[PDB]
Amino acid sequence: KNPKSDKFKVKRFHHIEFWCGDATNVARRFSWGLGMRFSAKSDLSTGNMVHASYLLTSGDLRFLFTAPYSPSLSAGEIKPTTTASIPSFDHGSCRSFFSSHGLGVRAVAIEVEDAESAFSISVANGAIPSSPPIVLNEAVTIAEVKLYGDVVLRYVSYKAEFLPGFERVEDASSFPLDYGIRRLDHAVGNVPELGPALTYVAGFTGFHQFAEFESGLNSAVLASNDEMVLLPINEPVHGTKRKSQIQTYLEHNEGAGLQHLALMSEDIFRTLREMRKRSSIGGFDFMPSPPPTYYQNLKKRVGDVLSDDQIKECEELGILVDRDDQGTLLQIFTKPLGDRPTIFIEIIQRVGCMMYQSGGCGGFGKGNFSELFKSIEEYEK
Amino acid sequence: KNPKSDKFKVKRFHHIEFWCGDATNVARRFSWGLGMRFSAKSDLSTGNMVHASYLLTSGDLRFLFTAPYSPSLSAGEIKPTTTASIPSFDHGSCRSFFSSHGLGVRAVAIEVEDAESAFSISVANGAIPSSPPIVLNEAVTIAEVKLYGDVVLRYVSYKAEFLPGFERVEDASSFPLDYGIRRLDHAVGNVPELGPALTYVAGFTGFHQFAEFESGLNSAVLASNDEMVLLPINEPVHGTKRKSQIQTYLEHNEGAGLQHLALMSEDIFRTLREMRKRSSIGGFDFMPSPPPTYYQNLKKRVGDVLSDDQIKECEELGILVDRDDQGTLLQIFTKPLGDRPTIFIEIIQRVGCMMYQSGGCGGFGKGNFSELFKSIEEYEK
C-alpha cells in the first residue's frame, strides 16, 4: 500500500555531501576507489575563501566533499558579502561536526519542485529548521532541515551546473573513471530510538512506510510518492548475545547519523571486479565473503533468476542475493569508509519490477540475516 | 666548512608524522600517489582507543598518518593507563592543530643514540619542551621539542618494529607498491623570521649551517654532523613584485610550519613516470613544466653529466636540474598535498659526491630560480 502522501513534490536524490577535514584527500581516495570522475569545484581557485568543495559524479550519483579553510581568509565577510558557494556552510558547524563524528555525511540532498515551499511546509509540519531557503544567482534554491543527529535533509530546486559558483573541472584533471555506479538507491540512518525518528521525518515529509517482505536492529523505511527516495532508519536492539553494531555505531559516532549509502550499479559484477582490484591500492575494502554453503543455497532460492555461472560469478565476488515477492536483489558491503566503525557503502543491483524499474525492487536484504547465519552454521559442519 | 658541533649523536631521519582528521583516507591516497606500502598500524584493532595511526613505507622513508578517535572511547583512561601507542598524543592538541593548519606535518622524527639525553641536552640549550622522554616497553624511547610553529622535532632511540604497540600489516592489506622512493632527503620549514628560527634550532641541536653554492624568500640550511639530517628554513621577502609565496603559506597555514618534504628516489625517471600516471586517478599533481628553452639550456649547464636522451627524458617528465661545485641535482615539485596552498612534496635524485654519497650533494636547487626566469623570458621570445 502506497498512500502517496508527500507534502511537497519530490523528484530524486540529488547529492550526498561529506564534511571533511581535508576535502582533497577524501575526494581523491573516493574517486579512485569508486570510479567517480571529478566534475565540479568551488574553492580558492574559483573565488571561494570560505570552504573547499569538490564534486565527484558517476552517472547520476553525486558525491560532494567539503572542508573549511582558515576563518582568517574570510574574516571580513558577512553573510551578505560571502564568497561561500554553499550559503548554509559554517566553519564552526563543520569543525564541530568533524571533531564529533569524524568523516561522514552532513547532507542528504533531494531535488524538489520548490525548495522554498518544501522548507516552509516541512517546518509547518514539525521539521527543525537548519538553513532557510536561499536563492543562488536567481537560478537555484537551497534549504535544509534536520534529519537525524547532525545530518540535514537538503532541498534543492532549479528554475531551469551543479550550483552557481561551482566551476566545471578542466579535462586534464577529470579522468573519465567509471566502474558502473549510476545512482543513489537509498541512504540509511542509525538512531537510538526508531519510533520517534520515524514519526518526526514522516511527520514533516509525508513520506510513507515502504512495504517489507536477533540480529541487533529494528528498521523501517520511509519512501516518497514514487518510492524513488528511500530513507531506511535503524535502531539498536539491546541485550543480544552479540552486541548490536547499531549501538557500536552510536558510540563511535557520538550519536545518531548516516550509517550507509547504497549505490546502484548497472553492472554489479563489473563494479565489484573494478573495486576489488583497487582495495589494497587506495580503494575500499569489502566485508568477509559468505561461506560456499551460501552460494550452494542460492540454487534453491534464486535458481530461476540467476544461472549457475551467474551464481558462480556472485561467489567469486562475494556478492549477496535476496528476494522478496516482486524482485531480486544483489548487494555487497564495504568495510567502514574511514577511521571509525561508522559509515560504510553498499553496492546494489535490482532485478525485476519492470513496468522503468519501480523503487526498492527486491527489498533491502533483510532475508540475508537468516541466510548468512544458516550458511555459517552449515559450513561449520 | 663543517664544525661537527652536534650536541648529541644523531643518526638519520626516522619518520614524518601527519596529523589528520581521518588517517585512513589520507594514508590510502598517499599510498597510491607515492607508491608506499602499508607497513604498520595502531588503532582500535590493536587495542588503541585513543588514536588511529597508519604507517606507510618506501625503502627507508616512513610516513605516519594519525587522527584522534572520539575522546569518549578513552574517557576513563589516564596517562598511566593509556592505550595510546604514541604517548605524546593529545586529542585536544591534534584537533587544534588540524583546525588551525589543515592537513600537515606535526612531527619531524630523527633517530638518535639516546632520546632521553637528546631531550635533556636540547632543553638545557634552549629547546622548548613538548613531550618528555617516555620509555615504551623498555625498548624504545621517544621525546619531543618544539621545532617551529606547531611542528615538533621528535627524538627516537632504540635499545636493539616501528614502535611498541604497532602491529605489522597483514599481507592481503599490504600491496607491495614501489615507485622508487627510498628516503627523506630534507624537510623544510616556513617561518616569519629566519634569523631567530635559525638561532633557536641551531642553539639546541648544535646543527651547523650547510654550505650553499627577488624570488620572495631568504633561506638557510641546518645540518647534522654527517649532513644527513638536513633542515632548511625559509622566511618571506616583502615588497616584491609577485607576493612572496612564503607569506601566502604563512597566511593559509595560520603561521609557521613545514613547507615541503623532499623524498630521494633511486630512479627519478621511474618515480615520475609512475606518479604522473596516477595524478588524475587519486595521486599527486605536479607544478607546470618549464618551457623547452629550459631543456635547451641544460646542454650548456649539465651536458657533461646527462646525455641528450637523459636530458630529453628530463623534459618529458618536467624534471628540473641544478648543479653546484660538487654535484648535480634532479628535482621536481608537486602541487599542494591538500586543500590549502601550504605543504607540498619534492622528488629528488642527486648525482656525484661519491666517497656512499655525501649529504646534500648538488645543493637544494637555488640556481633554478634564475634559470626558470631566464627560460620563461626566452620562451616568451
Ligand SMILES: O=C1CCCC(O)=C1C(=O)c1ccc2c(c1)N(Cc1ccc(C(F)(F)F)cc1)C(=O)CS2
Ligand atoms: O540492514 C538494513 C536494514 C534495512 C535497510 C538497509 O538498507 C539495510 C541493509 O542494507 C542490510 C540488510 C541486510 C544485511 C546487511 C545490510 N548487511 C550489512 C550489515 C551488517 C551488520 C548490521 C548490524 F550489525 F547493524 F546489524 C547491519 C547491516 C550484511 O552484511 C548482510 S545482511
Ligand SMILES: O=C1CCCC(O)=C1C(=O)c1ccc2c(c1)N(Cc1ccc(C(F)(F)F)cc1)C(=O)CS2
Ligand atoms: O626553495 C628552497 C630554499 C632552500 C631549501 C629548499 O629545499 C628549497 C627548494 O626545494 C627549492 C629550490 C629552488 C626551487 C624550488 C624549490 N621550486 C619550488 C618553489 C616554488 C616557489 C617558492 C617560493 F614561492 F616560496 F619562493 C619556493 C620553492 C621550484 O619550483 C623551482 S626553483
Ligand SMILES: [Co+2]
Ligand atoms: Co541497504
Ligand SMILES: [Co+2]
Ligand atoms: Co627542497
